[PDB]
Design a protein around this ligand. Structure first.
Ligand SMILES: Nc1nc2c(ncn2[C@@H]2O[C@H](COP(=O)(O)OP(=O)(O)OP(=O)(O)O)[C@@H](O)[C@H]2O)c(=O)[nH]1
Ligand SMILES: Nc1nc2c(ncn2[C@@H]2O[C@H](COP(=O)(O)OP(=O)(O)OP(=O)(O)O)[C@@H](O)[C@H]2O)c(=O)[nH]1
Ligand SMILES: Nc1nc2c(ncn2[C@@H]2O[C@H](COP(=O)(O)OP(=O)(O)O)[C@@H](O)[C@H]2O)c(=O)[nH]1
Ligand SMILES: [Mg+2]
Ligand SMILES: [Mg+2]
Lengths: 437, 50, 54, 107, 431, 51, 53, 54, 175, 51, 437
């Protein structure tokens, strides 16, 4: 009834989708075959899974996901291994030539090759849906399919589906660590085209979670599997209220209304607490105030933008577990009295609480310790203007000599798009400056 | 020839009787009643076109 | 509830029959790929050269 | 070509209720009344006769493929609030360009 | 199913390609007959990238061997892994080259190019995706330089949307071994810069130095040289054949490494490369592979990385490893030796990770560098070219095979202004 | 001598696989016993006065 | 030349005959299996058709 | 149908035991035919080869 | 219809951002006159001029063997479009069977700058900006008639390329 | 002695964007098919002499 | 007394009927030798076969067909095949020498030596059946027997039987795939004499069937056997209303009256849904809503045309299997509220449904799957105007300089018939445009 469609575009999107659907199967008791372990009656019989898994006439759970990439390696690796019978093969779209870290290749070239098939699969899934809540689109702001095809797909989704929720889960390029070279070019060109065709975009980088895994989890050399497991925990805490009964339920149509103060300001951060291991959780008494202070601590933020440098606009706190609203209220009151956390003057009511009774599940052989309570901390702050300024500085350094422009132009995008995109994010940068006062 | 198995048309390969229709490797594993034959040698042509 | 259970059992019967038909069809497809549609020439194709001195 | 209402059941037969998350097409609800003896205004061929007010739309309908969509899409803001005057102006500019290019591609 | 057509010209290119197919047949567990004898299915999924199906389980390489001297054709047919190749794509001539670029280009070398292009066209439209063309040769002889550049020009005229990567063994002045190699190199660099969009220049003196310091190697000969070249040949295309945490193919490397179109001459490298005496004293860690990538003596293009500024650096890792460790190492090198990096490109590193190591080693690494120190070999070739062009030496051969001195002047001017473009982009302010 | 050694390892592997299939078949049959037991409620028709 | 062919035909028949004798050993073991046999239990897959059948 | 089902496949297994023996015996006789032929050919090879020094 | 005189040369001269704003509309026409004479004098000696840009001028040799060491040759000069430009602008090229027994020489900036009172830095821009202006004219969907005076006219009408060779060229290049 | 930094950025400003390939895929695996010949793009209804 | 005479003209018609009578005898439980098994598998008399099979004195079930071809070996391999005892001997009529892709040779020279005998056989079958309902003419537009002799046969049937219904199944030539050069000549010559002598001709394209088998059944290299199995399933779904029981059932006289608006526009399009194989059929919904959404799709049409580039006139929908009227109704409603389908202005009611109860029968050696639901959709859209205009262009390319015309001139036909055929199909083009106006 509370159906959601998950579109995972790019290698980052597909790997995050692997780590997400593993956790979803562990939550809903689904084997990597699509079947209940017990019969139809015992060990199940509920209909809580219909937000993510549709049910055929025999009782086979198939996910409401569309896996898209232009290279075949990662999608074929999904098709052959572990969850080979769970995922639908027609919902595992892949192409021949990758976009090769190129926004314009993903937007006008091979990205435009596949968008008809992708929209056909999406409209089949939406016709299956009977009360669709929105599209969770997992991608990166890196190169290729995560920028170009994601922006083109969201443009087409805004064209045909109207004002349905289009929540992005976007991997933002970190201030120091970044893999591609043309990544500022792709990020500028994709934020320019996804400023308008978006409702909200949860912004989750890699370096901050690397520091989190070093400092709080003691992995000291984590990997993409750990990163995507934490991102999967984030998206599960966001989507939990649509599947589990709680004191305060939060649906997907609400995040835009409660986190977007002005148009084009739709980039909130993300934080999960308590992200910590077992030998450290043995010595702790983890409670509502402690995990709220951990959320508001400028070290558990999963994007390298410290909130000391800006003002909060909106604050979605998703409490999940055996949490009590009295201690929720006390913790939020003491955060409001705390001075290091700074809220903007035109927003006295800056908090939105969603309480769910389901305790945080744990992946077997995972990284996180099992806790009775967790918070998904989702803040829209002006501290991201620093990241936008740094990325615009990188774009201006790359664009003063206009290196790596001949690729984009010679395979099809006009050069005026670079200038209008930089103008659009300059306008965004001034927008954040004007919002901050 | 006999040895190459190339005298089978598409219609004779696919339009087989429905009682024996789901065959395996283009044959009938259950309809087979001639075993252990000795009379008959394969010549140079038969062994060359096998 | 009995009608719903009968519908689900009919679906399960269809799944079992389709699984048997699926393994048969996959065997047929692998047969038509790895056999039939291959042309390795035998010795009789090369025997018909250099058999006449004129 | 005639989605002519259901009175009590107009609450049902809606695109939102029948699993169509796409935006719906507006037929003419609430049928009208006529007098009688409608003109034949045709022949036994499919022609439209001479003097008939023929339409100026495409005979093959209005549909654009992927390789003839506009390169830029406005985004359906429909709000015009908390934006600057040049923002309102160029949002109208892209909306007008969108409408013109779809009209030219249909015609 | 993106896949690459391999072409190999001259004796040097043929021997490098033979070693290359030996290496990437070991990587897929293919015997010289052609059958697959591996253990895991990972060596069997992307076997179509370099091999084409035959009848049975036979895998015929998508390689074209071209030479004007039949002796090297007999040698590469009867040598190790000579049975893997198809006898039909062994097009040759029975004349020779004579180390003459004019003879390899405007004479009987252009007689063979009809059948050569027929073979390459057969392999090219025997495809379904056709990722690109990968050529190996040397700019020291006739068939390597002249015929190789003729194939480069014709193939780019045919398919100007495919990734064309050529390797080419550039001549070193302290190796010599030919007297007309500056003429052969100058007349071919013009066709390389204008047509080819990915070039990984390899130098024999750098190969000898690597063999003599990092590997001791009391008598290396031409086997170990082609072996290291084949290592860097496999390490740049490993992500097309094996999956990984962060994939990157030839087109992605060309996009992230080539800022401007005529800026595409690279500096390949490989790690680990450990001597027998130091085998037990070394622990394979990602920082150790990163250092051996970013060591000057480990370079395979005779340039010194300290003697110039890097523009872009592609780092392709193989084996199970940590993305955080890779990212911190490749950020720490930029933070440490920031003077040897252009400041108008933030994040001068493209990073790729494949989790399938070579047979044997658990981890390995591959360096590709678009350094501005590549100009020094071009300057050495240009100064030798003007030294033996000052007195019009050895020009009677080229004028007999049909060239004018104006082609030599074009070659010199193009090499000079290409080096000047390197110097101007090297000595550029941030903004 | 290696052929007669390899024949022993085949029977040892299939002997050890047979011991696993002894245990796995007992788990399936014990699963079905607990499958009917978990489905028993007050309104179950399965239910019986018995000793 | 003929002795090498006659040896080769012996080597083909001996490898075939070695397969026949212990395939009969398998089929006799299945023929002698009964209901009351203790080496009899539920199987994980059982009804599969292997490749090369 | 269950008691007759076991008996039907017991005869099918017993038919295959007799089916292999129809081919195991013929292959065993040909091995005796080949072994006798090899012994005859080696003697006649030796007879002509002993005539070489003759 | 768009000729080469007084529009492409003027656009390449003003050209907002230009490498060569000093040379005049007579000079860019005269350097392409020099290019035409260069192509003429190298094609005369059975060679083929290739310019990265428009395309390549070659022959189509029609060699029928008479017998007793004689042959009739029908020679036709053809202009094959550069496939990079053809794929970039989508023009329907006329494919011509061209053999590899034709030596191919690139455009000689040294030759075009030797007798000219100009230099290499100007003679290179004099062709790069002209190719850029012709590409802009192809974008503008205007009927391009770009001349090669002494050889022929290249016509781009509507997604088609065809070159009309002059009669004197067709009668002195036929062998 | 020309300034390559300026005389590359000039045609980086004003070089030609190419027309994207008018073709499509439908197999969930690639298999690019041209769209202009195919059967889907209407051109013969336009023609010049349709009536 | 719901009998149907099935005429199969040409090689394509003979092979299609070869795959068709296989499926009919498998549906009705008739053995390949023609003898229905003596009880123990069937109930009572069970004369549902009487629509297609008659009853001789020997108990043999001879079909109500005629396999006519102007060639040996193609009907002769049927005479020597596995159904050699099922067909009456002179029911299968063969010529001696080909028309050989020539409309003139099949219409004026060789056709008027076998047309009298095939009319006599059709007369015997029509006198035998007492409730003669219609003819089913299976042929191809490739030419030869399938065009010239089919046109002559329908011309004689129009004057012999009059208002009796004459459905056709025509193998229309593909847009880019063609096995013959003279196919435009043959098709436009036969589609000038078919129009005044037909009722309704379903239109089937081999390239579209190839694409359907490639993208749905996962056979990458399909075969004419698979094609003819699909057309056999189409005609079985059409004629199942006559043999089986249903809620509301569809006569053969329905297919003319409820589908063609004008006397010369009688070219509708078949569509089957689902067409999925057994490997993927266990892993979908098989709902009537999804199979209606699949049959209203450009990627599943049996002809290679885009229905989104034209307006529909009528849709005859044969629902076959476990379908319910209200889910059918809701499926039709959401199709009517979709964007990409636009009905024509003058046709308010554009649907005609028939619900049957018998599920489709699967051949054990085919490629399809056992399903409980199917839809045979017959769409009369204006998207075939593109196909007719393409045929006119391919005609005008050849006829502008009298290519291939000497064969037709010398083999009976005069020169002017090409001109009248071209003018007639130009008038058909004008009709197809002005209907869409
Ligand atoms: N958190 C996380 N980020 C990833 C993962 N895989 C890739 N990324 C991010 O993705 C960026 C690389 O670009 P991709 O998103 O993989 O490019 P793509 O979407 O596959 O499209 P192409 O450029 O054509 O390959 C890197 O900077 C990473 O930050 C992952 O597994 N987890
Ligand atoms: N769908 C389908 N079409 C077929 C089949 N066999 C032939 N065709 C079509 O028939 C066309 C060629 O005409 P034919 O039917 O072979 O010739 P004919 O009707 O017997 O008349 P003649 O040419 O005189 O022999 C081809 O274009 C095919 O599309 C088949 O088995 N299935
Ligand atoms: N690295 C390496 N260089 C080689 C090899 N074989 C030849 N060379 C170099 O190639 C140069 C001569 O090129 P050559 O083989 O004659 O080119 P060709 O005339 O086209 O065949 C010499 O200076 C050698 O140093 C080889 O196997 N490896
Ligand atoms: Mg990717
Ligand atoms: Mg025929």
């Amino acid at each position: 009834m509370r159906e959601c469609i998950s579109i995972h575009v790019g290698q980052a999107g597909v790997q995050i989708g692997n780590a997400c659907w593993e956790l979803y199967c562990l939550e809903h008791g689904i084997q990597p075959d699509g079947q209940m372990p017990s019969d139809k009656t015992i060990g199940g019989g509920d209909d809580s899974f219909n937000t993510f898994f549709s049910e055929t006439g025999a009782g086979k759970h198939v996910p409401r996901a569309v896996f898209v990439d232009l290279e075949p390696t990662v999608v074929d690796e999904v098709r052959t291994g572990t969850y080979r019978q769970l995922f639908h093969p027609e919902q595992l779209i892949t192409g021949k030539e990758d976009a090769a870290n190129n926004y314009a290749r993903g937007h006008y070239t091979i990205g435009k090759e596949i968008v008809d098939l992708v929209l056909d699969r999406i409209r089949k899934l939406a016709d299956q849906c009977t009360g669709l809540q929105g599209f969770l689109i997992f991608h990166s702001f890196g190169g290729g399919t995560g920028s170009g095809f994601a922006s083109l797909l969201m443009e087409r989704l805004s064209v045909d589906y109207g004002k349905k929720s289009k929540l992005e889960f976007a991997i933002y390029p970190a201030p120091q660590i970044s893999t591609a070279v043309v990544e500022p070019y792709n990020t500028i060109l994709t934020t320019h085209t996804t400023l308008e065709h978006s409702d909200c975009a949860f912004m989750v980088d890699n370096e901050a979670i690397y520091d989190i895994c070093r400092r709080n989890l003691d992995i000291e050399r984590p990997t993409y599997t750990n990163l995507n497991r934490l991102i999967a925990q984030i998206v599960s805490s966001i989507t939990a209220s649509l599947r589990f009964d709680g004191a305060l339920n939060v649906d997907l149509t609400e995040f835009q209304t409660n986190l977007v103060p002005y148009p084009r300001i739709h980039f909130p951060l993300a934080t999960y607490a308590p992200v910590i291991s077992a030998e450290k959780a043995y010595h702790e008494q983890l409670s509502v105030a402690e995990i709220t202070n951990a959320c508001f601590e400028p070290a558990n933020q999963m994007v390298k933008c410290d909130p000391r440098h800006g003002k909060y606009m909106a604050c979605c706190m998703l409490y999940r577990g055996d949490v009590v609203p009295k201690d929720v209220n006390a913790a939020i009151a003491t955060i409001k009295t705390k001075r290091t956390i700074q809220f903007v003057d035109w927003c006295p009511t800056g908090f939105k609480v969603g309480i769910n009774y389901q305790p945080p599940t744990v992946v077997p052989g995972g990284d996180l310790a099992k806790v009775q309570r967790a918070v998904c901390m989702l803040s829209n702050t002006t501290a991201i203007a620093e990241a936008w300024a740094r990325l615009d500085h990188k774009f201006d350094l790359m664009y003063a000599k206009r290196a790596f422009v001949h690729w984009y132009v010679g395979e099809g995008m006009e050069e005026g798009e670079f200038s209008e995109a930089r103008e659009d994010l300059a306008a965004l940068e001034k927008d954040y400056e004007e919002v901050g006062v | 020839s006999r040895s190459a198995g190339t005298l089978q048309t598409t219609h004779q390969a696919t339009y087989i009787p429905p009682r024996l229709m789901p065959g395996y490797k283009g044959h009938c594993p259950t309809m087979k009643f001639d075993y252990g034959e000795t009379y008959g040698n394969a010549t140079a042509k038969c062994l060359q076109d096998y | 509830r009995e009608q719903e259970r009968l519908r689900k059992e009919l679906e399960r019967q269809q799944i079992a029959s389709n699984s048997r038909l699926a393994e048969e069809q996959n065997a047929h497809q692998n047969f038509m790929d790895k056999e039939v549609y291959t042309n390795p020439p035998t010795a009789a194709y090369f025997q018909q050269f250099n058999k006449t001195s004129r | 070509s005639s989605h002519f209402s259901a009175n009590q059941y107009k609450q049902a037969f809606d695109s939102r209720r029948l699993q169509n998350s796409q935006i719906p097409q507006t037929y003419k609800e609430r049928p009208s009344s006529y007098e009688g003896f409608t003109q034949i205004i045709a022949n036994d061929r499919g022609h439209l006769k001479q003097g008939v007010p023929r339409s100026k739309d495409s005979p093959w309908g209005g549909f654009v493929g992927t390789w003839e969509m506009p390169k830029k899409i406005p985004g359906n803001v429909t709000t015009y609030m908390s934006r600057g005057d040049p923002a309102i102006d160029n949002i109208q500019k892209t909306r007008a360009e969108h409408n013109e290019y779809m009209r030219q591609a249909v015609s | 199913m993106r896949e690459i057509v391999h072409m190999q010209a001259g004796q040097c290119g043929n021997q490098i390609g033979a070693k290359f197919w030996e290496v990437i047949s070991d990587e897929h567990g293919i015997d010289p007959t052609g059958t697959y004898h591996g253990d895991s299915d990972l060596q069997l999924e992307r076997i179509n990238v370099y091999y084409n199906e035959a009848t049975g389980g036979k895998y015929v390489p998508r390689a074209v061997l071209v030479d004007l001297e039949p002796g090297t054709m007999d040698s590469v047919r009867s040598g190790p892994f000579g049975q893997i190749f198809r006898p039909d794509n062994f097009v040759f001539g029975q004349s020779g080259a004579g180390n003459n670029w004019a003879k390899g280009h405007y004479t009987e070398g252009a007689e063979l190019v009809d059948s050569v292009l027929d073979v390459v066209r057969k392999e090219a439209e025997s495809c379904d995706c056709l990722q690109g063309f990968q050529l190996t040769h040397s700019l020291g002889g006739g068939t390597g330089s002249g015929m190789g550049t003729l194939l480069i020009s014709k193939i780019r005229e045919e398919y100007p949307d495919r990734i064309m990567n050529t390797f080419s063994v550039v001549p070193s002045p302290k190796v010599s071994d030919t007297v007309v190699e500056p003429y052969n190199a100058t007349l071919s660099v013009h066709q390389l810069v204008e047509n080819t969009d990915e070039t990984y220049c390899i130098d024999n003196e750098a190969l000898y130095d690597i063999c003599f310091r990092t590997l001791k190697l009391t008598t290396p000969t031409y086997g170990d040289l082609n072996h290291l070249v084949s290592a860097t040949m496999s390490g740049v295309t490993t992500c097309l054949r094996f999956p990984g945490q962060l994939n990157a193919d030839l087109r992605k490397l060309a996009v992230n490494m080539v800022p401007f179109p005529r800026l595409h001459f690279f500096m390949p490298g490989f790690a680990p490369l450990t001597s027998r005496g130091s085998q037990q004293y070394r622990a394979l860690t990602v920082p150790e592979l990163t250092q051996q990538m970013f060591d000057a003596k480990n370079m395979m293009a005779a340039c010194d990385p300290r003697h110039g500024r890097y523009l872009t650096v592609a780092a392709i890792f193989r084996g199970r490893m940590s993305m955080k460790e890779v990212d911190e190492q490749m950020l720490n090198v930029q933070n440490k030796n920031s003077s040897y990096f252009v400041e108008w490109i933030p994040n001068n590193v493209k990073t790729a990770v494949c989790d399938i190591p070579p047979r044997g080693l658990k981890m390995s690494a591959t360096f590709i560098g678009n350094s501005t120190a590549i100009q020094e070999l071009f300057k050495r070739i240009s100064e030798q070219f003007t030294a033996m062009f000052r007195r019009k030496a050895f020009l009677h051969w080229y004028t007999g095979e049909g060239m004018d001195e104006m082609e030599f002047t074009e070659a010199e001017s193009n090499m000079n202004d290409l080096v000047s473009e390197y110097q101007q982009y090297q000595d550029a302010t941030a903004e | 001598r290696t052929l007669e050694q390899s024949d022993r390892q085949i029977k040892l592997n299939r002997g050890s696989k047979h011991k696993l299939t002894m245990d796995w078949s007992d788990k399936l049959s014990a699963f079905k016993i607990d499958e009917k037991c978990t489905g028993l409620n007050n309104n179950s028709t399965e239910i019986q006065y018995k000793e | 030349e003929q002795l090498c062919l006659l040896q080769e035909a012996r080597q083909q028949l001996h490898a075939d005959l070695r397969d026949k004798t212990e395939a009969k050993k398998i089929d006799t073991y299945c023929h002698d299996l009964t209901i009351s046999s203790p080496d009899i239990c539920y199987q994980p897959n059982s009804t599969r058709t292997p490749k090369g059948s | 149908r269950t008691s007759w089902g076991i008996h039907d496949n017991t005869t099918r297994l017993s038919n295959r035991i007799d089916d292999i023996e129809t081919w195991r015996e013929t292959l065993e006789k040909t091995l005796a035919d080949v072994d006798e032929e090899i012994r005859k050919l080696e003697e006649d090879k030796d007879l002509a080869e002993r005539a070489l020094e003759a | 219809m768009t000729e080469v005189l007084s529009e492409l040369v003027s656009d390449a001269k003003r050209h907002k951002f230009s490498t060569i704003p000093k040379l005049s509309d007579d000079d860019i026409v005269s350097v392409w006159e020099n290019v035409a004479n260069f192509v003429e004098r190298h094609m005369a000696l059975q060679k083929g001029v290739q310019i990265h840009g428009l395309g390549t001028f070659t022959f189509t040799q029609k060699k029928i063997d008479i017998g007793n060491n004689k042959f009739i040759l029908i020679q036709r000069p053809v202009f094959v479009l550069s496939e990079k430009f053809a794929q970039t602008h989508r023009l329907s090229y006329t494919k011509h069977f061209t053999s590899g027994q034709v030596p191919i020489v690139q455009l000689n900036f040294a030759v075009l700058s030797n007798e000219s009172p100009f230099d290499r830095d100007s003679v290179e821009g004099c062709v790069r900006e002209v190719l850029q202006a012709l590409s802009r004219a192809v974008q503008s969907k205007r009927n391009v008639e770009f001349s090669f005076t002494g050889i022929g006219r290249l016509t781009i009408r509507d997604s088609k390329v065809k070159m009309k060779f002059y009669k004197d060229f067709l009668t002195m290049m036929d062998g | 002695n020309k300034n390559f930094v300026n005389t590359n950025a000039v045609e980086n400003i004003m070089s030609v964007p190419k027309k994207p390939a008018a073709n499509f895929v439908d197999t969930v695996n690639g298999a690019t098919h041209p769209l202009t010949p195919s059967g889907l793009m209407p051109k013969y209804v336009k023609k010049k002499g349709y009536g």
